[PDB]
Amino acid sequence: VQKLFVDKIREYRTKRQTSGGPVDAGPEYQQDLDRELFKLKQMYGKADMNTFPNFTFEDPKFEAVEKPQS
Amino acid sequence: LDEATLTELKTVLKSFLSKGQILKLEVKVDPSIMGGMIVRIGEKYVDMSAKTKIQKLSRAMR
């Protein structure tokens, strides 16, 4: 069916004329890609784009031992 | 169809069997097959139709 071989490539080239993502999204693709974009961040964490690690650690304080001896 | 494309298929379907015989046939019209014809010489079923849209699952099958 090479007449069908040409007819699924030629209506693939029409999909390669794109402006803003989906062609017939409407309220469908706008809600779904925003529902999924939250879920990759919801149970994952709150993370910005480029912020480095900012913290500070304190070690164990070295106490002394009192000892009258001999 | 017309006479020039049917009397071939009432003669090129005789070229298969070749055993001194006088062939018979049935016709039934179906539009869900979009663009072809299926034929069944006995239990043979050479299928050429618009099933070939489902065979383009391999494009979506990695």
Side-chain angles (χ1 to χ4, degrees), chain A residues 1 3 6-8 10 12-13 18 20-21 23 25 47 64:
Chain A
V1 280
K3 300 290 103 177
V6 307
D7 285 345
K8 278 185 73 83
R10 286 184 203 178
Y12 160 68
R13 286 171 173 163
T18 313
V23 172

PDB file of all heavy atoms in Angstrom, chain A residues 1 3 6-8 10 12-13 18 20-21 23-25 34 38-39 41 47-48 57-58 61 64-65 67, unseen atoms left out:
ATOM      1  N   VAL A   1       0.831  -1.197   0.000  1.00  0.00           N
ATOM      2  CA  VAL A   1       0.000   0.000   0.000  1.00  0.00           C
ATOM      3  C   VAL A   1       0.875   1.259   0.000  1.00  0.00           C
ATOM      4  O   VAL A   1       0.823   2.076   0.921  1.00  0.00           O
ATOM      5  CB  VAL A   1      -1.003  -0.014   1.195  1.00  0.00           C
ATOM      6  CG1 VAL A   1      -2.198  -0.907   0.878  1.00  0.00           C
ATOM      7  CG2 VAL A   1      -0.334  -0.499   2.477  1.00  0.00           C
ATOM      8  N   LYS A   3       0.488   3.728  -1.871  1.00  0.00           N
ATOM      9  CA  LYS A   3      -0.404   4.879  -1.920  1.00  0.00           C
ATOM     10  C   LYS A   3      -0.846   5.294  -0.522  1.00  0.00           C
ATOM     11  O   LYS A   3      -1.278   6.431  -0.314  1.00  0.00           O
ATOM     12  CB  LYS A   3      -1.606   4.579  -2.814  1.00  0.00           C
ATOM     13  CG  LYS A   3      -1.263   4.243  -4.273  1.00  0.00           C
ATOM     14  CD  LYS A   3      -0.753   5.448  -5.078  1.00  0.00           C
ATOM     15  CE  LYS A   3       0.769   5.433  -5.284  1.00  0.00           C
ATOM     16  NZ  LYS A   3       1.247   6.559  -6.127  1.00  0.00           N
ATOM     17  N   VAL A   6       2.491   7.211   1.016  1.00  0.00           N
ATOM     18  CA  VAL A   6       2.638   8.634   0.747  1.00  0.00           C
ATOM     19  C   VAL A   6       1.622   9.441   1.548  1.00  0.00           C
ATOM     20  O   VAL A   6       1.850  10.616   1.849  1.00  0.00           O
ATOM     21  CB  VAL A   6       2.549   8.915  -0.769  1.00  0.00           C
ATOM     22  CG1 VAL A   6       3.526   8.034  -1.527  1.00  0.00           C
ATOM     23  CG2 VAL A   6       1.143   8.703  -1.304  1.00  0.00           C
ATOM     24  N   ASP A   7       0.507   8.823   1.944  1.00  0.00           N
ATOM     25  CA  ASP A   7      -0.599   9.608   2.482  1.00  0.00           C
ATOM     26  C   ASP A   7      -0.505   9.773   3.994  1.00  0.00           C
ATOM     27  O   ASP A   7      -1.299  10.509   4.590  1.00  0.00           O
ATOM     28  CB  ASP A   7      -1.934   8.980   2.085  1.00  0.00           C
ATOM     29  CG  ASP A   7      -2.274   9.221   0.629  1.00  0.00           C
ATOM     30  OD1 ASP A   7      -1.624  10.093   0.013  1.00  0.00           O
ATOM     31  OD2 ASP A   7      -3.191   8.555   0.104  1.00  0.00           O
ATOM     32  N   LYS A   8       0.435   9.081   4.639  1.00  0.00           N
ATOM     33  CA  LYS A   8       0.655   9.312   6.064  1.00  0.00           C
ATOM     34  C   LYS A   8       1.927  10.115   6.304  1.00  0.00           C
ATOM     35  O   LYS A   8       2.150  10.628   7.407  1.00  0.00           O
ATOM     36  CB  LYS A   8       0.696   7.986   6.819  1.00  0.00           C
ATOM     37  CG  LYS A   8      -0.675   7.433   7.141  1.00  0.00           C
ATOM     38  CD  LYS A   8      -0.569   6.185   7.988  1.00  0.00           C
ATOM     39  CE  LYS A   8      -0.169   6.509   9.413  1.00  0.00           C
ATOM     40  NZ  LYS A   8      -1.319   6.922  10.246  1.00  0.00           N
ATOM     41  N   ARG A  10       2.555  12.703   4.038  1.00  0.00           N
ATOM     42  CA  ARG A  10       2.121  14.025   3.598  1.00  0.00           C
ATOM     43  C   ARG A  10       1.205  14.696   4.616  1.00  0.00           C
ATOM     44  O   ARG A  10       1.121  15.928   4.660  1.00  0.00           O
ATOM     45  CB  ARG A  10       1.437  13.923   2.239  1.00  0.00           C
ATOM     46  CG  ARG A  10       2.408  13.696   1.095  1.00  0.00           C
ATOM     47  CD  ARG A  10       1.701  13.696  -0.239  1.00  0.00           C
ATOM     48  NE  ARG A  10       2.455  12.965  -1.246  1.00  0.00           N
ATOM     49  CZ  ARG A  10       2.037  12.777  -2.491  1.00  0.00           C
ATOM     50  NH1 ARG A  10       0.870  13.271  -2.878  1.00  0.00           N
ATOM     51  NH2 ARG A  10       2.784  12.097  -3.350  1.00  0.00           N
ATOM     52  N   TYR A  12       1.874  14.011   7.745  1.00  0.00           N
ATOM     53  CA  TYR A  12       2.793  14.271   8.846  1.00  0.00           C
ATOM     54  C   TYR A  12       3.489  15.615   8.652  1.00  0.00           C
ATOM     55  O   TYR A  12       3.779  16.319   9.627  1.00  0.00           O
ATOM     56  CB  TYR A  12       3.804  13.132   8.978  1.00  0.00           C
ATOM     57  CG  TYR A  12       5.043  13.522   9.739  1.00  0.00           C
ATOM     58  CD1 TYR A  12       4.988  13.795  11.102  1.00  0.00           C
ATOM     59  CD2 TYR A  12       6.264  13.644   9.092  1.00  0.00           C
ATOM     60  CE1 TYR A  12       6.122  14.177  11.797  1.00  0.00           C
ATOM     61  CE2 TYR A  12       7.400  14.016   9.779  1.00  0.00           C
ATOM     62  CZ  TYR A  12       7.322  14.282  11.129  1.00  0.00           C
ATOM     63  OH  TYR A  12       8.451  14.657  11.809  1.00  0.00           O
ATOM     64  N   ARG A  13       3.738  15.996   7.394  1.00  0.00           N
ATOM     65  CA  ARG A  13       4.355  17.288   7.099  1.00  0.00           C
ATOM     66  C   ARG A  13       3.451  18.446   7.501  1.00  0.00           C
ATOM     67  O   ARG A  13       3.938  19.527   7.855  1.00  0.00           O
ATOM     68  CB  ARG A  13       4.695  17.379   5.612  1.00  0.00           C
ATOM     69  CG  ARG A  13       5.892  16.549   5.195  1.00  0.00           C
ATOM     70  CD  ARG A  13       6.030  16.502   3.680  1.00  0.00           C
ATOM     71  NE  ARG A  13       7.270  15.851   3.268  1.00  0.00           N
ATOM     72  CZ  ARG A  13       7.497  15.381   2.048  1.00  0.00           C
ATOM     73  NH1 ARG A  13       6.567  15.487   1.109  1.00  0.00           N
ATOM     74  NH2 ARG A  13       8.656  14.804   1.764  1.00  0.00           N
ATOM     75  N   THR A  18       3.782  24.229  12.870  1.00  0.00           N
ATOM     76  CA  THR A  18       3.294  24.406  14.229  1.00  0.00           C
ATOM     77  C   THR A  18       3.720  25.783  14.718  1.00  0.00           C
ATOM     78  O   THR A  18       4.809  26.261  14.388  1.00  0.00           O
ATOM     79  CB  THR A  18       3.837  23.304  15.153  1.00  0.00           C
ATOM     80  OG1 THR A  18       3.681  22.033  14.514  1.00  0.00           O
ATOM     81  CG2 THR A  18       3.088  23.267  16.475  1.00  0.00           C
ATOM     82  N   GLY A  20       2.375  27.114  18.342  1.00  0.00           N
ATOM     83  CA  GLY A  20       2.438  27.207  19.789  1.00  0.00           C
ATOM     84  C   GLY A  20       2.233  25.933  20.585  1.00  0.00           C
ATOM     85  O   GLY A  20       1.625  25.979  21.657  1.00  0.00           O
ATOM     86  N   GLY A  21       2.736  24.798  20.100  1.00  0.00           N
ATOM     87  CA  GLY A  21       2.573  23.546  20.804  1.00  0.00           C
ATOM     88  C   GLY A  21       1.522  22.646  20.187  1.00  0.00           C
ATOM     89  O   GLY A  21       1.781  21.934  19.213  1.00  0.00           O
ATOM     90  N   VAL A  23      -2.125  21.839  18.212  1.00  0.00           N
ATOM     91  CA  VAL A  23      -2.997  22.430  17.204  1.00  0.00           C
ATOM     92  C   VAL A  23      -4.448  22.494  17.671  1.00  0.00           C
ATOM     93  O   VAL A  23      -5.104  23.534  17.503  1.00  0.00           O
ATOM     94  CB  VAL A  23      -2.866  21.649  15.883  1.00  0.00           C
ATOM     95  CG1 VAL A  23      -3.902  22.091  14.862  1.00  0.00           C
ATOM     96  CG2 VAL A  23      -1.464  21.809  15.323  1.00  0.00           C
ATOM     97  N   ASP A  24      -4.951  21.443  18.311  1.00  0.00           N
ATOM     98  CA  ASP A  24      -6.332  21.420  18.774  1.00  0.00           C
ATOM     99  C   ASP A  24      -6.405  21.133  20.265  1.00  0.00           C
ATOM    100  O   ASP A  24      -7.225  20.324  20.706  1.00  0.00           O
ATOM    101  CB  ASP A  24      -7.151  20.393  17.994  1.00  0.00           C
ATOM    102  N   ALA A  25      -5.550  21.787  21.053  1.00  0.00           N
ATOM    103  CA  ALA A  25      -5.564  21.578  22.497  1.00  0.00           C
ATOM    104  C   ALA A  25      -6.821  22.168  23.125  1.00  0.00           C
ATOM    105  O   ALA A  25      -7.650  21.441  23.685  1.00  0.00           O
ATOM    106  N   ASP A  34      -0.585  21.042  32.429  1.00  0.00           N
ATOM    107  CA  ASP A  34      -0.399  21.786  33.668  1.00  0.00           C
ATOM    108  C   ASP A  34      -0.702  20.917  34.882  1.00  0.00           C
ATOM    109  O   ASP A  34      -0.158  21.145  35.967  1.00  0.00           O
ATOM    110  CB  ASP A  34      -1.275  23.038  33.667  1.00  0.00           C
ATOM    111  N   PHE A  38       2.580  19.896  37.609  1.00  0.00           N
ATOM    112  CA  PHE A  38       2.546  19.990  39.063  1.00  0.00           C
ATOM    113  C   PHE A  38       2.998  18.689  39.704  1.00  0.00           C
ATOM    114  O   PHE A  38       3.718  18.705  40.707  1.00  0.00           O
ATOM    115  CB  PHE A  38       1.140  20.354  39.538  1.00  0.00           C
ATOM    116  N   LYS A  39       2.606  17.550  39.123  1.00  0.00           N
ATOM    117  CA  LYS A  39       2.848  16.257  39.757  1.00  0.00           C
ATOM    118  C   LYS A  39       4.315  15.852  39.675  1.00  0.00           C
ATOM    119  O   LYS A  39       4.784  15.024  40.467  1.00  0.00           O
ATOM    120  CB  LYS A  39       1.961  15.187  39.123  1.00  0.00           C
ATOM    121  N   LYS A  41       6.446  18.024  40.367  1.00  0.00           N
ATOM    122  CA  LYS A  41       6.976  18.904  41.395  1.00  0.00           C
ATOM    123  C   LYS A  41       6.252  18.784  42.732  1.00  0.00           C
ATOM    124  O   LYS A  41       6.766  19.290  43.736  1.00  0.00           O
ATOM    125  CB  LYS A  41       6.913  20.358  40.917  1.00  0.00           C
ATOM    126  N   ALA A  47      11.785  23.466  44.007  1.00  0.00           N
ATOM    127  CA  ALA A  47      13.134  23.724  43.534  1.00  0.00           C
ATOM    128  C   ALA A  47      13.115  24.818  42.477  1.00  0.00           C
ATOM    129  O   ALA A  47      12.309  24.791  41.545  1.00  0.00           O
ATOM    130  CB  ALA A  47      13.776  22.449  42.970  1.00  0.00           C
ATOM    131  N   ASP A  48      14.019  25.783  42.634  1.00  0.00           N
ATOM    132  CA  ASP A  48      14.176  26.867  41.673  1.00  0.00           C
ATOM    133  C   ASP A  48      15.082  26.408  40.529  1.00  0.00           C
ATOM    134  O   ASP A  48      15.371  25.218  40.370  1.00  0.00           O
ATOM    135  CB  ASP A  48      14.711  28.119  42.365  1.00  0.00           C
ATOM    136  N   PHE A  57      27.078  23.876  58.757  1.00  0.00           N
ATOM    137  CA  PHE A  57      27.104  22.743  59.673  1.00  0.00           C
ATOM    138  C   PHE A  57      27.967  23.066  60.882  1.00  0.00           C
ATOM    139  O   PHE A  57      28.977  23.765  60.760  1.00  0.00           O
ATOM    140  CB  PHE A  57      27.628  21.483  58.978  1.00  0.00           C
ATOM    141  N   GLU A  58      27.560  22.564  62.044  1.00  0.00           N
ATOM    142  CA  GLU A  58      28.318  22.706  63.279  1.00  0.00           C
ATOM    143  C   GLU A  58      28.705  21.330  63.807  1.00  0.00           C
ATOM    144  O   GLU A  58      27.875  20.419  63.862  1.00  0.00           O
ATOM    145  CB  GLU A  58      27.508  23.468  64.330  1.00  0.00           C
ATOM    146  N   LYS A  61      30.988  19.609  69.940  1.00  0.00           N
ATOM    147  CA  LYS A  61      31.842  20.367  70.842  1.00  0.00           C
ATOM    148  C   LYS A  61      32.666  19.419  71.705  1.00  0.00           C
ATOM    149  O   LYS A  61      32.126  18.504  72.332  1.00  0.00           O
ATOM    150  CB  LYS A  61      31.000  21.288  71.718  1.00  0.00           C
ATOM    151  N   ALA A  64      35.897  18.360  77.915  1.00  0.00           N
ATOM    152  CA  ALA A  64      37.055  17.830  78.613  1.00  0.00           C
ATOM    153  C   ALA A  64      36.605  16.889  79.724  1.00  0.00           C
ATOM    154  O   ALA A  64      35.423  16.833  80.075  1.00  0.00           O
ATOM    155  CB  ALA A  64      37.911  18.960  79.192  1.00  0.00           C
ATOM    156  N   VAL A  65      37.560  16.141  80.265  1.00  0.00           N
ATOM    157  CA  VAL A  65      37.314  15.200  81.347  1.00  0.00           C
ATOM    158  C   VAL A  65      38.148  15.619  82.548  1.00  0.00           C
ATOM    159  O   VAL A  65      39.373  15.755  82.442  1.00  0.00           O
ATOM    160  CB  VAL A  65      37.643  13.758  80.924  1.00  0.00           C
ATOM    161  N   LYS A  67      39.850  14.925  86.127  1.00  0.00           N
ATOM    162  CA  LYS A  67      40.415  13.707  86.691  1.00  0.00           C
ATOM    163  C   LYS A  67      41.514  13.985  87.706  1.00  0.00           C
ATOM    164  O   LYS A  67      42.680  14.146  87.325  1.00  0.00           O
ATOM    165  CB  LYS A  67      40.968  12.817  85.574  1.00  0.00           C
TER     166      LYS A  67
END
